Amino acid sequence: PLSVLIAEDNDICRLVAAKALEKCTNDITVVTNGLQALQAYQNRQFDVIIMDIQMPVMDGLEAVSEIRNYERTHNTKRASIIAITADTIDDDRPGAELDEYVSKPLNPNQLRDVVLTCHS
Amino acid sequence: PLSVLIAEDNDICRLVAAKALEKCTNDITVVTNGLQALQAYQNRQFDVIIMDIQMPVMDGLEAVSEIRNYERTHNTKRASIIAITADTIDDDRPGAELDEYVSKPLNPNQLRDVVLTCHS
């Protein structure tokens, strides 16, 4: 029997791939990011892995761009977007993408404070 | 009231962020990739978005590398890894990462054939 892992964030390709293989096996696990594929693999033996090597469709910063795109077209209220990052923050001015920065490792108190201030 | 979207594939940072904000609100949605953040946003108004701008922890090709790393350390059977991609395939020799290539848009018949052949 065949155990297959499908790692694909593209919803259409994920469904097409799962449907295609449905008649060959019941053992199909689907995941939508790279860490999830690795974690699935640590948990289960897979004979075959179908990997979108172009994954992700959009990384974090690109998702931010698309969110901003959404707000512009739909003419909706602007969300506060708080970036979390392990990198050193050398320029903390807000911009078109990000409203604030919080470094990792996360300090819960700091994150709450920043979230409540942006919300206000 | 505050509606918050947390987009973070790093399991530890995701839980820490969700826990931190639990007392401020019940309206917390968590997602683990960029497309999912966008889709959540199309579906629900969020006042605040907490985005890991380093996301993803690992892209598709990096996940492949970690899977291979897993097989080497654990001395386990080698999985067949089939890459799906929209890019033109100019070198279809298998290598340390990938065993075969299938182009998008996916042809179900082709994908099955390739999967069953790798499995054999």
Side-chain angles (χ1 to χ4, degrees), chain B residues 46-74:
Chain B
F46 297 99
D47 297 304
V48 180
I49 300 173
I50 295 166
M51 170 66 67
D52 187 337
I53 56 169
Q54 294 177 299
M55 190 176 71
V57 173
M58 58 190 68
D59 59 33
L61 277 173
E62 297 167 330
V64 173
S65 188
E66 299 282 355
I67 289 160
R68 294 300 191 202
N69 195 45
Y70 182 104
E71 298 176 339
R72 187 207 345 123
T73 63
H74 294 78

PDB file of all heavy atoms in Angstrom, chain B residues 46-74:
ATOM      1  N   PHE B  46     -10.240  42.067  10.760  1.00  0.00           N
ATOM      2  CA  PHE B  46      -9.305  42.069  11.865  1.00  0.00           C
ATOM      3  C   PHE B  46      -8.804  43.482  12.085  1.00  0.00           C
ATOM      4  O   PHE B  46      -8.405  44.168  11.154  1.00  0.00           O
ATOM      5  CB  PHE B  46      -8.139  41.121  11.574  1.00  0.00           C
ATOM      6  CG  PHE B  46      -8.562  39.668  11.440  1.00  0.00           C
ATOM      7  CD1 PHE B  46      -8.743  39.110  10.187  1.00  0.00           C
ATOM      8  CD2 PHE B  46      -8.828  38.884  12.588  1.00  0.00           C
ATOM      9  CE1 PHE B  46      -9.152  37.773  10.051  1.00  0.00           C
ATOM     10  CE2 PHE B  46      -9.236  37.554  12.485  1.00  0.00           C
ATOM     11  CZ  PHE B  46      -9.414  36.999  11.202  1.00  0.00           C
ATOM     12  N   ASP B  47      -8.833  43.896  13.340  1.00  0.00           N
ATOM     13  CA  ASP B  47      -8.364  45.184  13.780  1.00  0.00           C
ATOM     14  C   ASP B  47      -6.827  45.166  13.839  1.00  0.00           C
ATOM     15  O   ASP B  47      -6.167  46.165  13.564  1.00  0.00           O
ATOM     16  CB  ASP B  47      -8.895  45.394  15.238  1.00  0.00           C
ATOM     17  CG  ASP B  47     -10.425  45.428  15.293  1.00  0.00           C
ATOM     18  OD1 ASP B  47     -11.005  46.271  14.571  1.00  0.00           O
ATOM     19  OD2 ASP B  47     -11.047  44.595  15.995  1.00  0.00           O
ATOM     20  N   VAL B  48      -6.264  43.998  14.185  1.00  0.00           N
ATOM     21  CA  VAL B  48      -4.818  43.896  14.394  1.00  0.00           C
ATOM     22  C   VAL B  48      -4.343  42.579  13.784  1.00  0.00           C
ATOM     23  O   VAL B  48      -5.008  41.536  13.962  1.00  0.00           O
ATOM     24  CB  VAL B  48      -4.404  43.961  15.898  1.00  0.00           C
ATOM     25  CG1 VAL B  48      -2.896  43.844  16.016  1.00  0.00           C
ATOM     26  CG2 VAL B  48      -4.880  45.309  16.560  1.00  0.00           C
ATOM     27  N   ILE B  49      -3.194  42.628  13.143  1.00  0.00           N
ATOM     28  CA  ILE B  49      -2.592  41.410  12.574  1.00  0.00           C
ATOM     29  C   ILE B  49      -1.189  41.283  13.147  1.00  0.00           C
ATOM     30  O   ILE B  49      -0.398  42.226  13.085  1.00  0.00           O
ATOM     31  CB  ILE B  49      -2.563  41.492  11.051  1.00  0.00           C
ATOM     32  CG1 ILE B  49      -4.012  41.628  10.523  1.00  0.00           C
ATOM     33  CG2 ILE B  49      -1.849  40.274  10.463  1.00  0.00           C
ATOM     34  CD1 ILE B  49      -4.117  41.905   8.971  1.00  0.00           C
ATOM     35  N   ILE B  50      -0.855  40.106  13.683  1.00  0.00           N
ATOM     36  CA  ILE B  50       0.498  39.863  14.176  1.00  0.00           C
ATOM     37  C   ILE B  50       1.112  38.929  13.111  1.00  0.00           C
ATOM     38  O   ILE B  50       0.653  37.802  12.939  1.00  0.00           O
ATOM     39  CB  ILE B  50       0.479  39.194  15.552  1.00  0.00           C
ATOM     40  CG1 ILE B  50      -0.153  40.167  16.581  1.00  0.00           C
ATOM     41  CG2 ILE B  50       1.895  38.840  15.961  1.00  0.00           C
ATOM     42  CD1 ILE B  50      -0.519  39.479  17.858  1.00  0.00           C
ATOM     43  N   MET B  51       2.093  39.437  12.386  1.00  0.00           N
ATOM     44  CA  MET B  51       2.688  38.729  11.243  1.00  0.00           C
ATOM     45  C   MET B  51       4.161  38.417  11.479  1.00  0.00           C
ATOM     46  O   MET B  51       4.975  39.301  11.807  1.00  0.00           O
ATOM     47  CB  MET B  51       2.494  39.570   9.966  1.00  0.00           C
ATOM     48  CG  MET B  51       3.255  39.069   8.763  1.00  0.00           C
ATOM     49  SD  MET B  51       2.650  37.425   8.190  1.00  0.00           S
ATOM     50  CE  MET B  51       1.143  37.874   7.656  1.00  0.00           C
ATOM     51  N   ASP B  52       4.532  37.153  11.322  1.00  0.00           N
ATOM     52  CA  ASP B  52       5.968  36.824  11.358  1.00  0.00           C
ATOM     53  C   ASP B  52       6.495  37.177  10.004  1.00  0.00           C
ATOM     54  O   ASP B  52       6.152  36.520   9.001  1.00  0.00           O
ATOM     55  CB  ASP B  52       6.168  35.319  11.606  1.00  0.00           C
ATOM     56  CG  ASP B  52       7.632  34.984  11.814  1.00  0.00           C
ATOM     57  OD1 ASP B  52       8.486  35.780  11.341  1.00  0.00           O
ATOM     58  OD2 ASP B  52       7.940  33.981  12.493  1.00  0.00           O
ATOM     59  N   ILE B  53       7.296  38.236   9.925  1.00  0.00           N
ATOM     60  CA  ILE B  53       7.758  38.672   8.609  1.00  0.00           C
ATOM     61  C   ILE B  53       8.939  37.836   8.086  1.00  0.00           C
ATOM     62  O   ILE B  53       9.394  38.056   6.970  1.00  0.00           O
ATOM     63  CB  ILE B  53       8.020  40.199   8.579  1.00  0.00           C
ATOM     64  CG1 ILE B  53       9.021  40.579   9.666  1.00  0.00           C
ATOM     65  CG2 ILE B  53       6.684  40.931   8.727  1.00  0.00           C
ATOM     66  CD1 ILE B  53       9.566  42.085   9.544  1.00  0.00           C
ATOM     67  N   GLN B  54       9.402  36.897   8.902  1.00  0.00           N
ATOM     68  CA  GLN B  54      10.421  35.908   8.510  1.00  0.00           C
ATOM     69  C   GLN B  54       9.727  34.641   7.993  1.00  0.00           C
ATOM     70  O   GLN B  54      10.399  33.720   7.587  1.00  0.00           O
ATOM     71  CB  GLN B  54      11.324  35.574   9.682  1.00  0.00           C
ATOM     72  CG  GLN B  54      12.216  36.768  10.172  1.00  0.00           C
ATOM     73  CD  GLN B  54      13.066  36.459  11.397  1.00  0.00           C
ATOM     74  OE1 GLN B  54      12.566  36.145  12.472  1.00  0.00           O
ATOM     75  NE2 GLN B  54      14.375  36.589  11.231  1.00  0.00           N
ATOM     76  N   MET B  55       8.385  34.577   8.021  1.00  0.00           N
ATOM     77  CA  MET B  55       7.654  33.360   7.576  1.00  0.00           C
ATOM     78  C   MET B  55       7.870  33.193   6.077  1.00  0.00           C
ATOM     79  O   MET B  55       7.781  34.179   5.315  1.00  0.00           O
ATOM     80  CB  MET B  55       6.136  33.461   7.926  1.00  0.00           C
ATOM     81  CG  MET B  55       5.255  32.185   7.757  1.00  0.00           C
ATOM     82  SD  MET B  55       3.498  32.442   8.314  1.00  0.00           S
ATOM     83  CE  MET B  55       3.071  33.481   6.964  1.00  0.00           C
ATOM     84  N   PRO B  56       8.115  31.948   5.610  1.00  0.00           N
ATOM     85  CA  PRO B  56       8.069  30.644   6.299  1.00  0.00           C
ATOM     86  C   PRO B  56       9.375  30.262   6.974  1.00  0.00           C
ATOM     87  O   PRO B  56      10.425  30.675   6.494  1.00  0.00           O
ATOM     88  CB  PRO B  56       7.776  29.662   5.148  1.00  0.00           C
ATOM     89  CG  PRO B  56       8.454  30.289   3.936  1.00  0.00           C
ATOM     90  CD  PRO B  56       8.383  31.817   4.157  1.00  0.00           C
ATOM     91  N   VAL B  57       9.287  29.439   8.024  1.00  0.00           N
ATOM     92  CA  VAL B  57      10.472  28.833   8.687  1.00  0.00           C
ATOM     93  C   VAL B  57      11.272  28.083   7.623  1.00  0.00           C
ATOM     94  O   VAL B  57      12.504  28.129   7.601  1.00  0.00           O
ATOM     95  CB  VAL B  57      10.045  27.782   9.754  1.00  0.00           C
ATOM     96  CG1 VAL B  57      11.265  27.033  10.328  1.00  0.00           C
ATOM     97  CG2 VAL B  57       9.242  28.453  10.871  1.00  0.00           C
ATOM     98  N   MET B  58      10.549  27.376   6.761  1.00  0.00           N
ATOM     99  CA  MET B  58      11.187  26.643   5.650  1.00  0.00           C
ATOM    100  C   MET B  58      10.240  26.644   4.467  1.00  0.00           C
ATOM    101  O   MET B  58       9.037  26.437   4.660  1.00  0.00           O
ATOM    102  CB  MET B  58      11.653  25.239   6.093  1.00  0.00           C
ATOM    103  CG  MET B  58      10.599  24.280   6.650  1.00  0.00           C
ATOM    104  SD  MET B  58      11.146  22.695   7.447  1.00  0.00           S
ATOM    105  CE  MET B  58      11.966  23.208   8.920  1.00  0.00           C
ATOM    106  N   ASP B  59      10.751  26.974   3.282  1.00  0.00           N
ATOM    107  CA  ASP B  59       9.977  26.898   2.045  1.00  0.00           C
ATOM    108  C   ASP B  59       9.987  25.449   1.553  1.00  0.00           C
ATOM    109  O   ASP B  59      10.525  24.574   2.259  1.00  0.00           O
ATOM    110  CB  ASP B  59      10.500  27.845   0.940  1.00  0.00           C
ATOM    111  CG  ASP B  59      11.969  27.585   0.546  1.00  0.00           C
ATOM    112  OD1 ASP B  59      12.422  26.435   0.587  1.00  0.00           O
ATOM    113  OD2 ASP B  59      12.669  28.562   0.152  1.00  0.00           O
ATOM    114  N   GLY B  60       9.423  25.209   0.367  1.00  0.00           N
ATOM    115  CA  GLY B  60       9.224  23.811  -0.071  1.00  0.00           C
ATOM    116  C   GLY B  60      10.576  23.094  -0.189  1.00  0.00           C
ATOM    117  O   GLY B  60      10.783  21.952   0.335  1.00  0.00           O
ATOM    118  N   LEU B  61      11.487  23.740  -0.896  1.00  0.00           N
ATOM    119  CA  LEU B  61      12.815  23.138  -1.137  1.00  0.00           C
ATOM    120  C   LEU B  61      13.581  22.907   0.182  1.00  0.00           C
ATOM    121  O   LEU B  61      14.193  21.865   0.396  1.00  0.00           O
ATOM    122  CB  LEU B  61      13.623  23.975  -2.162  1.00  0.00           C
ATOM    123  CG  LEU B  61      13.334  23.699  -3.658  1.00  0.00           C
ATOM    124  CD1 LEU B  61      14.043  24.657  -4.593  1.00  0.00           C
ATOM    125  CD2 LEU B  61      13.653  22.225  -4.034  1.00  0.00           C
ATOM    126  N   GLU B  62      13.491  23.843   1.114  1.00  0.00           N
ATOM    127  CA  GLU B  62      14.100  23.655   2.423  1.00  0.00           C
ATOM    128  C   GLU B  62      13.471  22.502   3.223  1.00  0.00           C
ATOM    129  O   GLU B  62      14.152  21.792   3.959  1.00  0.00           O
ATOM    130  CB  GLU B  62      14.034  24.962   3.221  1.00  0.00           C
ATOM    131  CG  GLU B  62      14.834  26.112   2.563  1.00  0.00           C
ATOM    132  CD  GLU B  62      14.514  27.475   3.176  1.00  0.00           C
ATOM    133  OE1 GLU B  62      13.365  27.680   3.663  1.00  0.00           O
ATOM    134  OE2 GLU B  62      15.420  28.352   3.161  1.00  0.00           O
ATOM    135  N   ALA B  63      12.150  22.320   3.084  1.00  0.00           N
ATOM    136  CA  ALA B  63      11.456  21.195   3.725  1.00  0.00           C
ATOM    137  C   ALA B  63      11.969  19.886   3.167  1.00  0.00           C
ATOM    138  O   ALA B  63      12.198  18.957   3.921  1.00  0.00           O
ATOM    139  CB  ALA B  63       9.930  21.313   3.463  1.00  0.00           C
ATOM    140  N   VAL B  64      12.114  19.834   1.843  1.00  0.00           N
ATOM    141  CA  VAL B  64      12.764  18.690   1.197  1.00  0.00           C
ATOM    142  C   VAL B  64      14.133  18.387   1.803  1.00  0.00           C
ATOM    143  O   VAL B  64      14.397  17.241   2.191  1.00  0.00           O
ATOM    144  CB  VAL B  64      12.817  18.881  -0.304  1.00  0.00           C
ATOM    145  CG1 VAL B  64      13.660  17.769  -0.971  1.00  0.00           C
ATOM    146  CG2 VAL B  64      11.363  18.775  -0.829  1.00  0.00           C
ATOM    147  N   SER B  65      14.967  19.413   1.947  1.00  0.00           N
ATOM    148  CA  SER B  65      16.282  19.234   2.579  1.00  0.00           C
ATOM    149  C   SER B  65      16.172  18.622   3.988  1.00  0.00           C
ATOM    150  O   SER B  65      16.915  17.721   4.360  1.00  0.00           O
ATOM    151  CB  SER B  65      17.029  20.570   2.625  1.00  0.00           C
ATOM    152  OG  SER B  65      18.366  20.392   3.060  1.00  0.00           O
ATOM    153  N   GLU B  66      15.227  19.098   4.804  1.00  0.00           N
ATOM    154  CA  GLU B  66      15.039  18.603   6.162  1.00  0.00           C
ATOM    155  C   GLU B  66      14.503  17.174   6.215  1.00  0.00           C
ATOM    156  O   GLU B  66      14.844  16.356   7.088  1.00  0.00           O
ATOM    157  CB  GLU B  66      14.095  19.581   6.884  1.00  0.00           C
ATOM    158  CG  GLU B  66      14.639  20.996   6.994  1.00  0.00           C
ATOM    159  CD  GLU B  66      15.685  21.180   8.092  1.00  0.00           C
ATOM    160  OE1 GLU B  66      15.953  20.231   8.863  1.00  0.00           O
ATOM    161  OE2 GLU B  66      16.241  22.309   8.197  1.00  0.00           O
ATOM    162  N   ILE B  67      13.651  16.853   5.253  1.00  0.00           N
ATOM    163  CA  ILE B  67      13.192  15.486   5.095  1.00  0.00           C
ATOM    164  C   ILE B  67      14.338  14.550   4.768  1.00  0.00           C
ATOM    165  O   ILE B  67      14.481  13.521   5.389  1.00  0.00           O
ATOM    166  CB  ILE B  67      12.010  15.399   4.111  1.00  0.00           C
ATOM    167  CG1 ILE B  67      10.803  16.033   4.827  1.00  0.00           C
ATOM    168  CG2 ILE B  67      11.752  13.944   3.704  1.00  0.00           C
ATOM    169  CD1 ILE B  67       9.691  16.475   3.901  1.00  0.00           C
ATOM    170  N   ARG B  68      15.182  14.970   3.840  1.00  0.00           N
ATOM    171  CA  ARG B  68      16.359  14.180   3.507  1.00  0.00           C
ATOM    172  C   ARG B  68      17.277  14.047   4.730  1.00  0.00           C
ATOM    173  O   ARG B  68      17.821  12.950   4.999  1.00  0.00           O
ATOM    174  CB  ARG B  68      17.093  14.792   2.317  1.00  0.00           C
ATOM    175  CG  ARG B  68      16.236  14.714   1.027  1.00  0.00           C
ATOM    176  CD  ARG B  68      15.894  13.231   0.675  1.00  0.00           C
ATOM    177  NE  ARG B  68      15.321  13.167  -0.689  1.00  0.00           N
ATOM    178  CZ  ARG B  68      14.545  12.174  -1.141  1.00  0.00           C
ATOM    179  NH1 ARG B  68      14.239  11.125  -0.388  1.00  0.00           N
ATOM    180  NH2 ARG B  68      14.070  12.235  -2.384  1.00  0.00           N
ATOM    181  N   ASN B  69      17.455  15.153   5.462  1.00  0.00           N
ATOM    182  CA  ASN B  69      18.246  15.155   6.705  1.00  0.00           C
ATOM    183  C   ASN B  69      17.660  14.101   7.664  1.00  0.00           C
ATOM    184  O   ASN B  69      18.376  13.306   8.254  1.00  0.00           O
ATOM    185  CB  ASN B  69      18.248  16.571   7.308  1.00  0.00           C
ATOM    186  CG  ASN B  69      19.318  16.780   8.385  1.00  0.00           C
ATOM    187  OD1 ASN B  69      20.470  16.392   8.222  1.00  0.00           O
ATOM    188  ND2 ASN B  69      18.928  17.430   9.490  1.00  0.00           N
ATOM    189  N   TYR B  70      16.330  14.070   7.788  1.00  0.00           N
ATOM    190  CA  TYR B  70      15.702  13.109   8.650  1.00  0.00           C
ATOM    191  C   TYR B  70      16.054  11.677   8.266  1.00  0.00           C
ATOM    192  O   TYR B  70      16.344  10.805   9.118  1.00  0.00           O
ATOM    193  CB  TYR B  70      14.158  13.297   8.640  1.00  0.00           C
ATOM    194  CG  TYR B  70      13.455  12.324   9.570  1.00  0.00           C
ATOM    195  CD1 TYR B  70      12.951  12.740  10.811  1.00  0.00           C
ATOM    196  CD2 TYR B  70      13.269  10.975   9.210  1.00  0.00           C
ATOM    197  CE1 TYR B  70      12.336  11.819  11.683  1.00  0.00           C
ATOM    198  CE2 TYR B  70      12.653  10.066  10.064  1.00  0.00           C
ATOM    199  CZ  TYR B  70      12.155  10.495  11.300  1.00  0.00           C
ATOM    200  OH  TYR B  70      11.544   9.609  12.164  1.00  0.00           O
ATOM    201  N   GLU B  71      15.978  11.392   6.967  1.00  0.00           N
ATOM    202  CA  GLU B  71      16.211  10.028   6.500  1.00  0.00           C
ATOM    203  C   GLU B  71      17.659   9.608   6.792  1.00  0.00           C
ATOM    204  O   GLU B  71      17.924   8.427   7.109  1.00  0.00           O
ATOM    205  CB  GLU B  71      15.944   9.955   5.004  1.00  0.00           C
ATOM    206  CG  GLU B  71      14.513  10.285   4.644  1.00  0.00           C
ATOM    207  CD  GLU B  71      14.271  10.297   3.125  1.00  0.00           C
ATOM    208  OE1 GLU B  71      15.244  10.452   2.337  1.00  0.00           O
ATOM    209  OE2 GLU B  71      13.092  10.265   2.754  1.00  0.00           O
ATOM    210  N   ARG B  72      18.561  10.558   6.672  1.00  0.00           N
ATOM    211  CA  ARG B  72      19.996  10.244   6.860  1.00  0.00           C
ATOM    212  C   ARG B  72      20.298   9.901   8.320  1.00  0.00           C
ATOM    213  O   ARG B  72      20.925   8.852   8.630  1.00  0.00           O
ATOM    214  CB  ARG B  72      20.897  11.375   6.397  1.00  0.00           C
ATOM    215  CG  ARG B  72      22.395  10.947   6.455  1.00  0.00           C
ATOM    216  CD  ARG B  72      23.360  12.069   6.658  1.00  0.00           C
ATOM    217  NE  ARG B  72      22.810  13.398   6.436  1.00  0.00           N
ATOM    218  CZ  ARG B  72      22.826  14.361   7.342  1.00  0.00           C
ATOM    219  NH1 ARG B  72      23.384  14.167   8.536  1.00  0.00           N
ATOM    220  NH2 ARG B  72      22.318  15.536   7.042  1.00  0.00           N
ATOM    221  N   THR B  73      19.836  10.754   9.221  1.00  0.00           N
ATOM    222  CA  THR B  73      20.112  10.502  10.637  1.00  0.00           C
ATOM    223  C   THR B  73      19.421   9.238  11.135  1.00  0.00           C
ATOM    224  O   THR B  73      20.034   8.372  11.775  1.00  0.00           O
ATOM    225  CB  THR B  73      19.712  11.698  11.487  1.00  0.00           C
ATOM    226  OG1 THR B  73      18.302  11.922  11.384  1.00  0.00           O
ATOM    227  CG2 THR B  73      20.396  12.929  11.008  1.00  0.00           C
ATOM    228  N   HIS B  74      18.132   9.121  10.835  1.00  0.00           N
ATOM    229  CA  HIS B  74      17.358   8.018  11.346  1.00  0.00           C
ATOM    230  C   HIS B  74      17.684   6.729  10.555  1.00  0.00           C
ATOM    231  O   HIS B  74      17.267   5.637  10.913  1.00  0.00           O
ATOM    232  CB  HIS B  74      15.862   8.411  11.346  1.00  0.00           C
ATOM    233  CG  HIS B  74      15.514   9.522  12.290  1.00  0.00           C
ATOM    234  ND1 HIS B  74      15.767  10.852  12.024  1.00  0.00           N
ATOM    235  CD2 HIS B  74      14.919   9.494  13.508  1.00  0.00           C
ATOM    236  CE1 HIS B  74      15.332  11.593  13.026  1.00  0.00           C
ATOM    237  NE2 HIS B  74      14.818  10.790  13.939  1.00  0.00           N
TER     238      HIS B  74
END
